[PDB]
Design a protein around this motif. Sequence first.
Motif, PDB file in Angstrom:
ATOM      1  N   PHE A   1     -19.442 -20.871   8.388  1.00 55.44           N
ATOM      2  CA  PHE A   1     -20.780 -20.541   8.804  1.00 55.44           C
ATOM      3  C   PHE A   1     -21.512 -19.891   7.575  1.00 55.44           C
ATOM      4  CE2 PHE A   1     -17.989 -19.729  12.603  1.00 55.44           C
ATOM      5  CZ  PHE A   1     -18.772 -20.456  13.533  1.00 55.44           C
TER       6      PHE A   1
ATOM      7  N   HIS B   1     -26.051  -9.058   3.633  1.00 54.29           N
ATOM      8  CA  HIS B   1     -25.955  -9.579   4.725  1.00 54.29           C
ATOM      9  C   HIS B   1     -25.223  -8.345   5.553  1.00 54.29           C
ATOM     10  CE1 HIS B   1     -26.731 -12.345   7.844  1.00 54.29           C
ATOM     11  NE2 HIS B   1     -25.361 -12.352   8.320  1.00 54.29           N
TER      12      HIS B   1
ATOM     13  N   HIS C   1     -27.180 -17.019  17.003  1.00 56.78           N
ATOM     14  CA  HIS C   1     -25.863 -17.152  17.141  1.00 56.78           C
ATOM     15  C   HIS C   1     -25.279 -18.239  17.921  1.00 56.78           C
ATOM     16  CE1 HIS C   1     -26.087 -13.405  14.781  1.00 56.78           C
ATOM     17  NE2 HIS C   1     -24.946 -13.332  14.383  1.00 56.78           N
TER      18      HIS C   1
ATOM     19  N   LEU D   1     -26.504 -21.223  15.677  1.00 56.58           N
ATOM     20  CA  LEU D   1     -25.317 -21.379  14.771  1.00 56.58           C
ATOM     21  C   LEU D   1     -24.084 -22.050  15.512  1.00 56.58           C
ATOM     22  CD1 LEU D   1     -26.400 -17.832  12.949  1.00 56.58           C
ATOM     23  CD2 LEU D   1     -26.982 -20.277  12.300  1.00 56.58           C
TER      24      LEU D   1
ATOM     25  N   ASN E   1     -15.468 -14.663  18.231  1.00 53.95           N
ATOM     26  CA  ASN E   1     -15.964 -14.206  16.672  1.00 53.95           C
ATOM     27  C   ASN E   1     -16.404 -12.675  16.856  1.00 53.95           C
ATOM     28  OD1 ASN E   1     -14.387 -16.457  15.421  1.00 53.95           O
ATOM     29  ND2 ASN E   1     -16.151 -17.675  16.165  1.00 53.95           N
TER      30      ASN E   1
ATOM     31  N   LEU F   1     -15.220  -9.267  14.688  1.00 52.90           N
ATOM     32  CA  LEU F   1     -16.036  -8.617  13.915  1.00 52.90           C
ATOM     33  C   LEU F   1     -16.064  -7.116  14.270  1.00 52.90           C
ATOM     34  CD1 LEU F   1     -17.929  -7.991  11.492  1.00 52.90           C
ATOM     35  CD2 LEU F   1     -19.676  -8.985  12.858  1.00 52.90           C
TER      36      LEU F   1
HETATM   37  C1  HEM Z   1     -21.595  -8.941  17.216  1.00 45.73           C
HETATM   38  C2  HEM Z   1     -21.623  -8.757  15.804  1.00 45.73           C
HETATM   39  C3  HEM Z   1     -22.692  -9.421  14.943  1.00 45.73           C
HETATM   40  C4  HEM Z   1     -23.965  -8.865  14.743  1.00 45.73           C
HETATM   41  C5  HEM Z   1     -24.482  -7.520  15.087  1.00 45.73           C
HETATM   42  C6  HEM Z   1     -24.724  -9.953  13.916  1.00 45.73           C
HETATM   43  C7  HEM Z   1     -25.827  -9.723  13.209  1.00 45.73           C
HETATM   44  C8  HEM Z   1     -26.626 -10.726  12.643  1.00 45.73           C
HETATM   45  C9  HEM Z   1     -27.953 -10.233  12.008  1.00 45.73           C
HETATM   46  C10 HEM Z   1     -28.721  -9.091  12.429  1.00 45.73           C
HETATM   47  C11 HEM Z   1     -28.339 -11.548  11.421  1.00 45.73           C
HETATM   48  C12 HEM Z   1     -29.520 -11.600  10.813  1.00 45.73           C
HETATM   49  C13 HEM Z   1     -30.940 -12.133  11.592  1.00 45.73           C
HETATM   50  C14 HEM Z   1     -31.691 -12.984  10.667  1.00 45.73           C
HETATM   51  O1  HEM Z   1     -32.352 -12.374   9.722  1.00 45.73           O
HETATM   52  O2  HEM Z   1     -32.309 -14.014  10.995  1.00 45.73           O
HETATM   53  C15 HEM Z   1     -27.295 -12.381  11.356  1.00 45.73           C
HETATM   54  C16 HEM Z   1     -27.023 -13.802  10.941  1.00 45.73           C
HETATM   55  C17 HEM Z   1     -26.079 -14.355  10.841  1.00 45.73           C
HETATM   56  N1  HEM Z   1     -24.831 -14.351  11.640  1.00 45.73           N
HETATM   57 FE1  HEM Z   1     -24.334 -12.712  12.675  1.00 45.73          FE
HETATM   58  N2  HEM Z   1     -23.885 -10.980  13.637  1.00 45.73           N
HETATM   59  C18 HEM Z   1     -22.738 -10.719  14.535  1.00 45.73           C
HETATM   60  C19 HEM Z   1     -21.687 -11.446  14.420  1.00 45.73           C
HETATM   61  C20 HEM Z   1     -21.442 -12.847  13.943  1.00 45.73           C
HETATM   62  C21 HEM Z   1     -19.975 -13.590  13.802  1.00 45.73           C
HETATM   63  C22 HEM Z   1     -18.812 -13.182  14.564  1.00 45.73           C
HETATM   64  C23 HEM Z   1     -20.595 -14.562  13.123  1.00 45.73           C
HETATM   65  C24 HEM Z   1     -19.561 -15.607  12.932  1.00 45.73           C
HETATM   66  C25 HEM Z   1     -18.835 -15.874  11.912  1.00 45.73           C
HETATM   67  C26 HEM Z   1     -21.801 -14.601  12.620  1.00 45.73           C
HETATM   68  C27 HEM Z   1     -22.757 -15.329  11.780  1.00 45.73           C
HETATM   69  C28 HEM Z   1     -23.743 -15.285  11.235  1.00 45.73           C
HETATM   70  C29 HEM Z   1     -24.647 -16.208  10.386  1.00 45.73           C
HETATM   71  C30 HEM Z   1     -24.023 -17.584  10.013  1.00 45.73           C
HETATM   72  C31 HEM Z   1     -25.757 -15.963  10.346  1.00 45.73           C
HETATM   73  C32 HEM Z   1     -26.819 -16.409   9.602  1.00 45.73           C
HETATM   74  C33 HEM Z   1     -26.516 -16.131   7.928  1.00 45.73           C
HETATM   75  C34 HEM Z   1     -27.442 -16.765   7.021  1.00 45.73           C
HETATM   76  O3  HEM Z   1     -28.599 -16.000   7.092  1.00 45.73           O
HETATM   77  O4  HEM Z   1     -27.276 -17.846   6.276  1.00 45.73           O
HETATM   78  N3  HEM Z   1     -22.616 -13.296  12.910  1.00 45.73           N
HETATM   79  N4  HEM Z   1     -26.053 -11.874  12.016  1.00 45.73           N
END
Ligand code: HEM
Lengths: 146, 146, 141, 141
Positions: free
Chosen positions: A41, A63, A92, A96, A102, A106
């Motif tokens: 991812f 990040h 997500h 995504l 997952n 985390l």
């Molecule tokens: C439950 C806990 C998690 C929280 C609180 C969280 C929070 C966030 C936040 C705040 C963003 C950015 C929003 C934006 O600026 O558009 C983000 C992006 C992302 N998250 Fe999570 N996330 C969590 C778990 C996960 C997990 C388990 C995965 C999978 C491995 C994941 C994959 C991603 C991906 C791929 C992005 C976009 C990254 C990019 O900018 O290319 N997240 N997440």
Amino acid sequence: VHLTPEEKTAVNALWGKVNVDAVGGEALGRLLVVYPWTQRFFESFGDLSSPDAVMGNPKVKAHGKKVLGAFSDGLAHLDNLKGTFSQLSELHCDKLHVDPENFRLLGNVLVCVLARNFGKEFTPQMQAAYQKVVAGVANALAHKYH
Amino acid sequence: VHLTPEEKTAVNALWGKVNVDAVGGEALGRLLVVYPWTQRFFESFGDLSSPDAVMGNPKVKAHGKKVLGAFSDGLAHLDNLKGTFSQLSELHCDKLHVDPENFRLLGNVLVCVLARNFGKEFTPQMQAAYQKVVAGVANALAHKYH
Amino acid sequence: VLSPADKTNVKAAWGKVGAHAGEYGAEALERMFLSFPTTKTYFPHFDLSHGSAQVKGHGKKVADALTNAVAHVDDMPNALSALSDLHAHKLRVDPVNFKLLSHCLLVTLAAHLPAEFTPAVHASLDKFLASVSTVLTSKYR
Amino acid sequence: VLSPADKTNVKAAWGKVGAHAGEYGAEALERMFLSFPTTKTYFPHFDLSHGSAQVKGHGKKVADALTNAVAHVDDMPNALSALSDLHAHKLRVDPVNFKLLSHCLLVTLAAHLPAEFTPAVHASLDKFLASVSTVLTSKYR
Ligand code: HEM
Ligand code: HEM
Ligand code: HEM
Ligand code: HEM
Ligand SMILES: [C-]#N
Ligand SMILES: [C-]#N
Ligand SMILES: [C-]#N
Ligand SMILES: [C-]#N
């Protein structure tokens, strides 16, 4: 998420000592290491070829810091978690395609970083509180699926 | 659980052919045989000391009918699942302590059983439609955790 | 961990499957893509249409892989190391997807071989696939 | 499936436990009981009160079991056939609980031995504990 008066106070106290610039990165890092497939991812983040590359990668640190930001947002509104994470869930989940399992990983990895960075202060009691917190964040993180 | 019209007639057309006195017992028996540990929640049911004993067990067959009924009851209330399944969620999650992952497994075993009793009729489209149902039923039972 | 009795039901079971594994492999995928839409993101450039030639041929490949897995049910890490390299090192496939596939192969098998898919064979085939899933989703070289 | 590098991390890290092997097993247990209350249902007639002697004693065995596990990390099925008889056949412990304790062991280690809990050792202790969980929740007689 219910936290008794003592828990809410003990939770915040430790969270206030959390290096907002190092812990988020160590949590995201570790997730990527301990659970490899999650790396798929993050193909745009650069090098992730070794444990040291992942932990030292700038985009992982930057990040992860946003990740902790989301968690804190949750700590400040434990009674409106689904409304608080409604935006992140559709992303997500429907944008995504991240499987809910997952989120739980985390959430748990963060608990480990916390235990590693705070030691014997991260008592079994303190852990128990953080475990309701991480479950709530992960659960709210998957609402656009239930 | 949303089903397009076509699926709703197909799902209920196959279900209407379901032997209500066996399928439930087959699905529950298979869960106990395929995922051994689920036998702990049914320890007063007697002999579960082998596949045949489990599948032949009077109480497994009897309780399986009650399980199928809850499933038929859902097919009739796909728009109020968490509501309709509120009491059982209370039973399974708070009184029983059945990990949610087992609800998913039972829903799938039911599918396997359906595939076994109906063959060529249980098409990939039919299965797809039924997967949304069971996941819908499992999510509803797991609510107390959500 | 598989039991001797498990290894015996597996070999016997896949045995009747015989020259039909290939076909059972394509149906499984087809069922997996239909019921679990998100699994298709692993196959972007593929032609995943009802009856695609690509789906049937690839199914054949997954089919022969399992056949091979069964003959070497005692030392699968060594026998499946190449495919481990693929799904775990290169594709970085989330383990949830394997359960989806394993399930769809059980459904497919149950549909074709009603009498052979006994509760005992069911259990064993499940443990077998689960073990195969662990090897393919692991990084152990 | 454990790699040659995974085994090497586990052996290095579980060796520092030394005499605190079941000071760590008691903690993870307490941590588990407090964090995830349903796990206490497996200990109906145990004094699970805070600082209980029975939980300490039970923490020692748990810890030693893992030490013996580490020692035969390449023949765990045979090595842990008895524990498998206990947790899989007699107690029928739901698999989810092994994930809870494993996590709690990963916390007792990150708390007690920060310099050992590197990301590579963390990921290796996780896999290793998942392998032991499989072995103890699998009937392979
Ligand atoms: C439950 C806990 C998690 C929280 C609180 C969280 C929070 C966030 C936040 C705040 C963003 C950015 C929003 C934006 O600026 O558009 C983000 C992006 C992302 N998250 Fe999570 N996330 C969590 C778990 C996960 C997990 C388990 C995965 C999978 C491995 C994941 C994959 C991603 C991906 C791929 C992005 C976009 C990254 C990019 O900018 O290319 N997240 N997440
Ligand atoms: C997801 C599908 C399931 C459905 C639709 C279902 C439905 C039911 C129903 C209708 C009852 C009757 C209770 C009452 O009258 O209020 C029941 C009882 C029970 N269920 Fe389930 N159940 C499911 C899954 C499970 C699973 C996975 C387990 C765990 C192995 C489980 C364990 C039990 C137990 C222990 C009882 C009480 C049995 C007794 O009478 O002693 N159920 N279930
Ligand atoms: C135990 C089950 C599985 C087996 C035995 C299996 C086997 C195989 C084999 C033999 C190949 C071909 C290698 C070659 O090119 O010679 C392959 C490719 C592939 N597999 Fe799997 N596979 C399994 C599960 C999965 C799952 C669950 C996914 C993800 C949903 C997946 C995704 C892929 C992808 C993306 C490719 C490469 C496709 C391409 O670009 O041509 N596989 N698999
Ligand atoms: C890394 C995983 C685990 C290991 C290595 C382990 C090891 C052991 C050992 C060595 C015993 C002692 C038997 C004896 O020799 O007298 C035992 C007992 C027991 N274990 Fe575990 N165990 C593990 C996980 C679990 C889990 C997750 C549960 C469920 C919450 C559990 C529940 C029990 C119970 C109920 C007993 C019997 C306690 C008694 O009545 O004395 N174990 N375990
Ligand atoms: C978000 N990782
Ligand atoms: C219900 N079992
Ligand atoms: C490949 N499935
Ligand atoms: C066993 N604890």
